Design a protein around this ligand. Sequence first.
Ligand SMILES: *[C@@H]1O[C@H](CO)[C@@H](O[C@@H]2O[C@H](CO)[C@@H](O[C@@H]3O[C@H](CO[C@H]4O[C@H](CO)[C@@H](O)[C@H](O)[C@@H]4O)[C@@H](O)[C@H](O)[C@@H]3O)[C@H](O)[C@H]2NC(C)=O)[C@H](O)[C@H]1NC(C)=O
Ligand SMILES: *[C@@H]1O[C@H](CO)[C@@H](O[C@@H]2O[C@H](CO)[C@@H](O[C@@H]3O[C@H](CO[C@H]4O[C@H](CO)[C@@H](O)[C@H](O)[C@@H]4O)[C@@H](O)[C@H](O)[C@@H]3O)[C@H](O)[C@H]2NC(C)=O)[C@H](O)[C@H]1NC(C)=O
Ligand SMILES: *[C@@H]1O[C@H](CO)[C@@H](O[C@@H]2O[C@H](CO)[C@@H](O[C@@H]3O[C@H](CO)[C@@H](O)[C@H](O)[C@@H]3O)[C@H](O)[C@H]2NC(C)=O)[C@H](O)[C@H]1NC(C)=O
Ligand SMILES: *[C@@H]1O[C@H](CO)[C@@H](O[C@@H]2O[C@H](CO)[C@@H](O[C@@H]3O[C@H](CO)[C@@H](O)[C@H](O)[C@@H]3O)[C@H](O)[C@H]2NC(C)=O)[C@H](O)[C@H]1NC(C)=O
Ligand SMILES: *[C@@H]1O[C@H](CO)[C@@H](O[C@@H]2O[C@H](CO)[C@@H](O[C@@H]3O[C@H](CO)[C@@H](O)[C@H](O)[C@@H]3O)[C@H](O)[C@H]2NC(C)=O)[C@H](O)[C@H]1NC(C)=O
Ligand SMILES: *[C@@H]1O[C@H](CO)[C@@H](O[C@@H]2O[C@H](CO)[C@@H](O[C@@H]3O[C@H](CO)[C@@H](O)[C@H](O)[C@@H]3O)[C@H](O)[C@H]2NC(C)=O)[C@H](O)[C@H]1NC(C)=O
Ligand SMILES: *[C@@H]1O[C@H](CO)[C@@H](O[C@@H]2O[C@H](CO)[C@@H](O)[C@H](O)[C@H]2NC(C)=O)[C@H](O)[C@H]1NC(C)=O
Ligand SMILES: *[C@@H]1O[C@H](CO)[C@@H](O[C@@H]2O[C@H](CO)[C@@H](O)[C@H](O)[C@H]2NC(C)=O)[C@H](O)[C@H]1NC(C)=O
Ligand SMILES: *[C@@H]1O[C@H](CO)[C@@H](O[C@@H]2O[C@H](CO)[C@@H](O)[C@H](O)[C@H]2NC(C)=O)[C@H](O)[C@H]1NC(C)=O
Ligand SMILES: *[C@@H]1O[C@H](CO)[C@@H](O[C@@H]2O[C@H](CO)[C@@H](O)[C@H](O)[C@H]2NC(C)=O)[C@H](O)[C@H]1NC(C)=O
Ligand SMILES: *[C@@H]1O[C@H](CO)[C@@H](O[C@@H]2O[C@H](CO)[C@@H](O)[C@H](O)[C@H]2NC(C)=O)[C@H](O)[C@H]1NC(C)=O
Ligand SMILES: *[C@@H]1O[C@H](CO)[C@@H](O[C@@H]2O[C@H](CO)[C@@H](O)[C@H](O)[C@H]2NC(C)=O)[C@H](O)[C@H]1NC(C)=O
Ligand SMILES: *[C@@H]1O[C@H](CO)[C@@H](O[C@@H]2O[C@H](CO)[C@@H](O)[C@H](O)[C@H]2NC(C)=O)[C@H](O)[C@H]1NC(C)=O
Ligand SMILES: *[C@@H]1O[C@H](CO)[C@@H](O)[C@H](O)[C@H]1NC(C)=O
Ligand SMILES: *[C@@H]1O[C@H](CO)[C@@H](O)[C@H](O)[C@H]1NC(C)=O
Ligand SMILES: *[C@@H]1O[C@H](CO)[C@@H](O)[C@H](O)[C@H]1NC(C)=O
Ligand SMILES: *[C@@H]1O[C@H](CO)[C@@H](O)[C@H](O)[C@H]1NC(C)=O
Lengths: 767, 767
Amino acid sequence: ARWFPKTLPCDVTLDVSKNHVIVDCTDKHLTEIPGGIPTNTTNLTLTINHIPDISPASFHRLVHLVEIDFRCNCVPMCPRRLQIKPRSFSGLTYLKSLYLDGNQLLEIPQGLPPSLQLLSLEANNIFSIRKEQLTELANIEILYLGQNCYYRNPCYVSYSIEKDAFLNLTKLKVLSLKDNNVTTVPTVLPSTLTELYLYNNMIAEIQEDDFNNLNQLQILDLSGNCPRCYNAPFPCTPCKNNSPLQIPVNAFDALTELKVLRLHSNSLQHVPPRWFKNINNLQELDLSQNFLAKEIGDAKFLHFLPNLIQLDLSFNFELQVYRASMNLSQAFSSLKSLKILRIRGYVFKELKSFQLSPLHNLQNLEVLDLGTNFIKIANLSMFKQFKRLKVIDLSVNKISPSGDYARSCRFKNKEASFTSVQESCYKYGQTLDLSKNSIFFIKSSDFQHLSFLKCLNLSGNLISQTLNGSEFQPLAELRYLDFSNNRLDLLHSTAFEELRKLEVLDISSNSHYFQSEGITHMLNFTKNLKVLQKLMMNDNDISSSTSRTMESESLRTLEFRGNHLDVLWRDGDNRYLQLFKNLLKLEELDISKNSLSFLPSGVFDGMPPNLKNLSLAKNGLKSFIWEKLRYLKNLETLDLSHNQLTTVPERLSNCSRSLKNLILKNNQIRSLTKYFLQDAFQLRYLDLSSNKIQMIQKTSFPENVLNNLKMLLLHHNRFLCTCDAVWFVWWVQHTEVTIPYLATDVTCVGPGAHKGQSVISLDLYTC
Amino acid sequence: ARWFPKTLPCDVTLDVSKNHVIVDCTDKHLTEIPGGIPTNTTNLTLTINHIPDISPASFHRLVHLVEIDFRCNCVPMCPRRLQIKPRSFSGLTYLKSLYLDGNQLLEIPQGLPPSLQLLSLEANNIFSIRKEQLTELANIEILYLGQNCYYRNPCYVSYSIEKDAFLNLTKLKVLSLKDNNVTTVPTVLPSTLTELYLYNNMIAEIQEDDFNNLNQLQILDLSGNCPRCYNAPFPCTPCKNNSPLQIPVNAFDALTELKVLRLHSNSLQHVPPRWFKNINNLQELDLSQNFLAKEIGDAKFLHFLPNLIQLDLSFNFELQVYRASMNLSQAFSSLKSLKILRIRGYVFKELKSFQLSPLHNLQNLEVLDLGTNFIKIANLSMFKQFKRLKVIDLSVNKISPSGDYARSCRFKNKEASFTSVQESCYKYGQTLDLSKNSIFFIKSSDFQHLSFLKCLNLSGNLISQTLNGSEFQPLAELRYLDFSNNRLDLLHSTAFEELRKLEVLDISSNSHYFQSEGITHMLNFTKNLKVLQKLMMNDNDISSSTSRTMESESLRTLEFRGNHLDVLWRDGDNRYLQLFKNLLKLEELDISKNSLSFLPSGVFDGMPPNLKNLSLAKNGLKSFIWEKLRYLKNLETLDLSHNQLTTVPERLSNCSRSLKNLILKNNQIRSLTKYFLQDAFQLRYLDLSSNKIQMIQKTSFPENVLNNLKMLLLHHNRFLCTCDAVWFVWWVQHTEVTIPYLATDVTCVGPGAHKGQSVISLDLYTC
Ligand SMILES: *[C@@H]1O[C@H](CO)[C@@H](O[C@@H]2O[C@H](CO)[C@@H](O[C@@H]3O[C@H](CO[C@H]4O[C@H](CO)[C@@H](O)[C@H](O)[C@@H]4O)[C@@H](O)[C@H](O)[C@@H]3O)[C@H](O)[C@H]2NC(C)=O)[C@H](O)[C@H]1NC(C)=O
Ligand SMILES: *[C@@H]1O[C@H](CO)[C@@H](O[C@@H]2O[C@H](CO)[C@@H](O[C@@H]3O[C@H](CO[C@H]4O[C@H](CO)[C@@H](O)[C@H](O)[C@@H]4O)[C@@H](O)[C@H](O)[C@@H]3O)[C@H](O)[C@H]2NC(C)=O)[C@H](O)[C@H]1NC(C)=O
Ligand SMILES: *[C@@H]1O[C@H](CO)[C@@H](O[C@@H]2O[C@H](CO)[C@@H](O[C@@H]3O[C@H](CO)[C@@H](O)[C@H](O)[C@@H]3O)[C@H](O)[C@H]2NC(C)=O)[C@H](O)[C@H]1NC(C)=O
Ligand SMILES: *[C@@H]1O[C@H](CO)[C@@H](O[C@@H]2O[C@H](CO)[C@@H](O[C@@H]3O[C@H](CO)[C@@H](O)[C@H](O)[C@@H]3O)[C@H](O)[C@H]2NC(C)=O)[C@H](O)[C@H]1NC(C)=O
Ligand SMILES: *[C@@H]1O[C@H](CO)[C@@H](O[C@@H]2O[C@H](CO)[C@@H](O[C@@H]3O[C@H](CO)[C@@H](O)[C@H](O)[C@@H]3O)[C@H](O)[C@H]2NC(C)=O)[C@H](O)[C@H]1NC(C)=O
Ligand SMILES: *[C@@H]1O[C@H](CO)[C@@H](O[C@@H]2O[C@H](CO)[C@@H](O[C@@H]3O[C@H](CO)[C@@H](O)[C@H](O)[C@@H]3O)[C@H](O)[C@H]2NC(C)=O)[C@H](O)[C@H]1NC(C)=O
Ligand SMILES: *[C@@H]1O[C@H](CO)[C@@H](O[C@@H]2O[C@H](CO)[C@@H](O)[C@H](O)[C@H]2NC(C)=O)[C@H](O)[C@H]1NC(C)=O
Ligand SMILES: *[C@@H]1O[C@H](CO)[C@@H](O[C@@H]2O[C@H](CO)[C@@H](O)[C@H](O)[C@H]2NC(C)=O)[C@H](O)[C@H]1NC(C)=O
Ligand SMILES: *[C@@H]1O[C@H](CO)[C@@H](O[C@@H]2O[C@H](CO)[C@@H](O)[C@H](O)[C@H]2NC(C)=O)[C@H](O)[C@H]1NC(C)=O
Ligand SMILES: *[C@@H]1O[C@H](CO)[C@@H](O[C@@H]2O[C@H](CO)[C@@H](O)[C@H](O)[C@H]2NC(C)=O)[C@H](O)[C@H]1NC(C)=O
Ligand SMILES: *[C@@H]1O[C@H](CO)[C@@H](O[C@@H]2O[C@H](CO)[C@@H](O)[C@H](O)[C@H]2NC(C)=O)[C@H](O)[C@H]1NC(C)=O
Ligand SMILES: *[C@@H]1O[C@H](CO)[C@@H](O[C@@H]2O[C@H](CO)[C@@H](O)[C@H](O)[C@H]2NC(C)=O)[C@H](O)[C@H]1NC(C)=O
Ligand SMILES: *[C@@H]1O[C@H](CO)[C@@H](O[C@@H]2O[C@H](CO)[C@@H](O)[C@H](O)[C@H]2NC(C)=O)[C@H](O)[C@H]1NC(C)=O
Ligand SMILES: *[C@@H]1O[C@H](CO)[C@@H](O)[C@H](O)[C@H]1NC(C)=O
Ligand SMILES: *[C@@H]1O[C@H](CO)[C@@H](O)[C@H](O)[C@H]1NC(C)=O
Ligand SMILES: *[C@@H]1O[C@H](CO)[C@@H](O)[C@H](O)[C@H]1NC(C)=O
Ligand SMILES: *[C@@H]1O[C@H](CO)[C@@H](O)[C@H](O)[C@H]1NC(C)=O
């Protein structure tokens, strides 16, 4: 509630349906908590700042607070550790969540309210755990005590937990003890635990009664214990004699609701089937970064996982061993519900069709990861049986053509699963990611029996070929093709002619052949592509073009950034003025970073009629004309950021009748016209931040136009706060226009003592 | 003769034994020829400048000139073409050589003296050749008329040569017609020709009487005629139907003294043995960039080349064809005198031992080039039979470990053979250049049967390994090892321990594992290397080191540039002060680009006692102490160029008693001490160029010290030419100290009209 604030430099978000008020003071360099904080707020954000300590009077009048964040308030360049006065949190009866990460605390704070449900104490100096200060946390549910003693934040003392310290926490559900130098599992954990995170510790042995009472556990993590330290870019200590993490056969017996089990980087050598005897509902299993190269050939334990969804076996290669072929056990056919399989780091020479026979009967298999394996010989025709597969990974391996602040400072989710990189080519269907491979020329015979491929990635292969319309012949149903970081010779206009169903084409980073001058550059090759929608050819350094115009009856998006359009539009050269005129359906243009010092008169007349998104960022426009914008009758998102413009148009209404997203970020504008926004009711977005503007007059910024503006930025510039802008001073602190960084970035240059003064916090009584 | 010049801005070199005086005015921006040119000079250099034309009075008083250079005086940003007045060269009776390249001349200049022997007319607009203006050149010997009409300098007209134009040039020996758009060989060439250069032309057919009278010819070039235009980064026009260069069988019949024959890039398909029937003394043969992939398997023509020395067969791959193996004909055994063989661009999958059987009996074979072939499988043990070989090339191909201005503006030599890149590893003996390969880990078994290798290059392989002293076991006689552009983990001090005879070790560009902090960095691994002489570990970004000191009893050169020595020598950290103290035999140090803002007191005490070459360039030394140089009793080549120093030492004699090569290039020094060079008789080299110095006093630059100075640089700085430096003005134009760029780079800032005035050309009479 309270809606209208007074001088708070933090953003305020209101949710009437959820009855939640959010105050975000992230990255504000506040030495102390500002005054005037509303009593109706619920979430308080107090991240990285210069707060010396916490006083009980800080939250004296705040009783509706349910979330307090204090993450990374002092990262070890920082003063002494934060001190918490006694009874500093007892007044918050409605508190439910509290974050105290990165505060260099020595002991667990006391006096916490009994209504607390979440507590985070990561990146602290708490290496001792006793029941006395845990008695007050009898109603807690989620506890985060990780990252207290490890290589980044050392304490030189092993973690000490007294007996039955967590036993009385009946409401505990999630416990995290990662990177805490823990040696022994803290028995006895409460029976209501669901997620246990003991990874990245120094645990060497597991007792048979360690998880005897945990029956509702769902997520168990035991990574980093006795890890594989070979070629490790971080300080890790192998266990002795290379010994593996000793886990008894009858260890996971009481676990019946377990769903996620992570054993990554444990130096394991054998996986007994007795482990998975009781856990029948296991879904995700991680066994990466181990020494299970021989176990994969046997994989006897896979017979007890009928409901497995994810299986990770990455980076299990043997030292000084180069396998001739991948040895997949026949027990892999028992994974009926398997969906994702990763066999990276299993470096081997040749991949054959019969080696993937166990995976032929997996109906639910979607993702098959095989990258980073240095596969030399691989017949691509063997993938014709994997039509149901969604993503096939053929990454940095060497397949060739066939011959004849800290972590806790952000990410409030804390313990979260590894989110897979969702590439733009996955949504189009079947994907064959052949990027960064040893393919140097394309043959139509290699891609045979692959008519079902809806996507193909060939970035980084460094292919030097002159396509003429016969290489991608079998790829009849291909819709997305990536050809970035290659050497494409556009000597013929029939390139990509046989790709009848192609929609998105990427030929970026092909600067090699485009940099040469005098050779033919057929830029009209898009005419044959009937259903092409997006074309990305940026960072190509295109300086000359044999074709006068580019023709495409369906192209909608064209990226032409990082090229040389100044030479194409050189003074006295009108050949390439109407280069984009024939693109009838084009709606978005990205001609940026083209070293365009000036725009010759006539380019706007040659622009496509349906242009809607024009960008000219980082171009260095010394003088950009404005009267020529009348030709574009559909422009709505003109962008001129990071340019060297110096004059705004006399009347924006006379220039464009549909512009609504004007952007002039990081420009050099000292003053605006006296009728800059006169009768321009169609505008909704305006940006003038990072400029050299001095003052704004009333006649240039009418309130009628400003009422409908969704966003307006005037921060990080050189405004002068004298008695000549009393109207601006009154309006900036009395309007509802969303102006971000109104009290943190925009300051006053002068005069004199007014250096660094907040404009919204200005009151010139003598004016 | 004449020894002492007056105001010439060109360097003068005297050779009394050869009676030759050399005047070099290269890159001087002289609008007109300067006055006071000596009449005794012999070689005149008048390269790229702003000379409008040539007048007969330019060489009126010069009669001893024997060489005039006018290369690239107007490169097409340039005014109208250079005009030569009639009878502008008839007064030079002793002229023998004349260069007129890059002058945009339309016709051959007339009035040349009959004593001329060399004439260069490259990069001109002369596309017509007639006997009338060639009559005056009856005594010429070397003619250069190439680069007159091609893609860089087009003329849109085919070259026209009248019948028997060169017939009467009886003294002609070398003729060049490269890149001249020539269609037909200009019959009839004189019988005294020795070198003919008709390459890079549009010749489509060769007549049987084309070389009927050439019996003394030695070098013949026919490249570029009907070239292989596939993947060509330059504008080339394939001949029709791909047709090859039609050469009759009885074409090279009259040639008996021919030694070099170049047929590179001719689209040849078959090489009949009839061509080499008469030429028995052929030494170098070039057949690269052709379609002779099938001919290599036959190679029937190789039986007629018993004295062949060089054979080039690079880039003869077939389009859309990936050969399974290299097919070398058995006729290669007939090349008894073969020394260099290049089989690049013959892309094939696997290389076997039996495929190199024809080369097993070549006793004189030294270089075997096989790079850029994409070889996948290659057993390195098959090279044990090639012990007599000097260089073995295993370049960018994908071998993996075994499994289980213009051109004429410079280069006065003009037509010169392609000089092979002499790498630093060739002088040490047998070389196995395995750079840029697909090797990702090193095994001792792979390098078996290779004990004869004296050099090994492994740069760019990107190997991530933690060597412990067992990988390079069979390489007992290795003396040079290159490990640049890799990922070396120095977790053990026993690395490279088994390389008992290693002398030079290069571990540069290994920044990956050295950038990480907290892991062990054993920098004392050089202790085991008993005979190590040079160690290059630059560009490694070394910021921490587990070892306190580096020990080596034989190391002499150490390159430590592009690292992080500021953190190692951080204030309050004296652990790594004596890092190089134990290097007793060290004599050269290259600690540069280390971001050293300042040198902590004590590093000079920890320097090796035998240090002789210290470099601190591009370090940013804000304040470099000088009194500590007394510790180094053997310093002679101190370098502080490209630094941010601001004060010179009070007395250089008190600082160092042996410094003789002080360098302070690109520094920021405004003034020198009044006793900078007092009693410093041991100095021989001094550099203060590119500084902000204002004036030099007499008491700081005594003539006694300046007499023995070999070189002294004071150019490109901010000297002030007022009446306060009359002694400097008198001395700079009255001393014999070698000061380069005395009249071209060093100018006067002021005062007023004295902007840009030459210091050596100053005469203040009013002073
Ligand atoms: C202001 O503070 C409030 C508390 O003081 C915040 O309310 C919290 O909002 C989160 C959601 O953002 C709730 O989390 C719930 O989690 C359960 C369990 O899901 C678990 O598993 C999923 C994966 O399947 C995982 O993503 C979750 O993080 C959990 O680990 C869900 O079923 C719920 O739908 C919900 O996501 C908290 O319970 C809730 N706290 C309280 C006390 O209600 C609020 O988000 C804050 N607002 C801002 C803007 O920061
Ligand atoms: C000043 O001008 C003088 C002429 O006006 C220059 O004298 C010339 O010097 C060059 C050497 O630099 C002489 O070239 C001779 O070439 C023959 C033939 O060798 C040929 O083959 C070799 C490869 O084996 C090749 O490198 C050569 O270039 C030749 O193609 C050699 O046998 C000789 O030793 C010598 O190298 C000229 O003959 C000579 N000209 C005259 C008229 O004597 C002088 O070099 C100029 N000085 C400067 C500093 O520019
Ligand atoms: C995680 O906990 C273990 C507990 O053992 C820590 O190991 C201990 O580390 C300290 C600090 O390096 C060692 O103290 C050392 O003692 C030697 C004398 O023996 C002294 O010369 C050193 O200067 C140092 O004070 C201690 O010995 C060692 N414990 C054992 C059993 O070896 C480890 O450091 C902790 N990890 C982190 C990141 O804090
Ligand atoms: C085809 O495969 C290539 C290589 O596998 C993909 O290129 C890679 O794409 C990812 C995601 O866009 C890039 O990651 C990003 O890197 C930047 C730094 O450049 C970082 O700031 C981002 O946060 C993100 O991590 C990755 O750099 C890029 N690799 C290269 C060499 O460009 C490409 O996206 C694939 N194409 C399709 C259509 O899937
Ligand atoms: C090397 O010599 C050949 C000699 O044939 C040159 O080919 C000629 O090039 C000119 C200029 O491009 C061509 O003239 C053209 O004529 C057409 C009408 O046919 C006109 O529309 C063009 O605007 C142009 O004026 C000429 O036809 C052509 N000769 C032949 C037989 O095709 C070639 O240009 C020369 N190369 C260089 C680098 O100068
Ligand atoms: C081992 O093999 C590698 C690669 O074959 C050699 O590196 C290459 O060395 C050459 C000659 O020093 C470099 O050429 C130079 O390039 C610079 C530009 O970087 C240019 O300014 C010079 O004029 C010259 O052309 C080449 O760049 C370099 N390649 C790489 C990737 O670094 C290496 O020298 C070999 N080592 C030994 C001991 O022979
Ligand atoms: C694939 O892995 C399996 C399991 O490790 C291998 O089968 C074992 O092979 C060894 C060596 O011959 C025998 O001693 C074992 O008795 C075999 N066990 C079983 C269950 O068969 C198999 O040889 C591997 N195949 C390849 C090609 O490496
Ligand atoms: C990759 O596998 C496919 C199919 O298994 C091979 O295609 C065969 O090609 C030959 C010659 O073109 C035909 O005679 C066969 O009938 C094809 N097989 C089938 C099942 O139709 C292809 O040759 C393999 N690639 C390589 C390099 O061996
Ligand atoms: C596209 O390029 C391919 C590759 O050169 C052409 O295929 C060749 O065509 C020629 C002329 O008909 C034949 O002599 C070759 O035998 C063909 N090679 C192969 C491997 O088939 C193809 O004709 C070109 N297509 C177009 C339309 O230019
Ligand atoms: C793309 O434009 C080029 C010209 O820039 C077109 O090439 C011309 O094609 C016609 C028709 O065969 C020829 O008569 C001309 O001689 C060609 N000119 C050049 C310079 O090659 C090409 O056809 C166009 N392609 C498309 C698909 O429109
Ligand atoms: C290596 O090259 C030789 C010469 O081209 C090949 O020998 C020819 O092979 C063809 C095809 O079998 C025959 O028609 C010719 O009669 C052969 N000529 C001679 C002189 O033998 C040979 O087959 C090639 N070998 C390989 C492995 O490619
Ligand atoms: C590369 O060639 C060498 C020699 O030709 C092979 O060395 C053989 O190795 C086996 C097993 O170690 C021995 O039984 C043989 O006696 C060796 N040959 C000789 C001549 O001594 C080596 O195996 C080959 N590499 C590969 C990958 O096959
Ligand atoms: C290089 O220096 C390291 C120390 O920085 C040496 O390692 C020590 O070796 C001794 C002898 O075995 C051990 O007692 C120490 O515990 C080691 N210290 C560490 C930190 O590992 C190493 O031996 C030196 N190597 C050489 C060749 O002198
Ligand atoms: C124009 O591009 C911007 C880029 O952020 C996008 O937000 C906007 O929706 C686009 N407008 C149209 C009409 O596509
Ligand atoms: C500017 O706008 C006014 C008012 O609509 C109009 O009268 C005038 O013609 C316009 N001028 C230009 C150059 O568009
Ligand atoms: C010191 O290094 C320079 C680098 O050019 C070299 O010229 C000089 O000979 C070296 N001096 C000694 C004594 O090696
Ligand atoms: C400087 O040199 C003079 C003369 O040799 C000597 O007397 C004096 O002690 C020296 N001072 C220093 C600091 O070296």
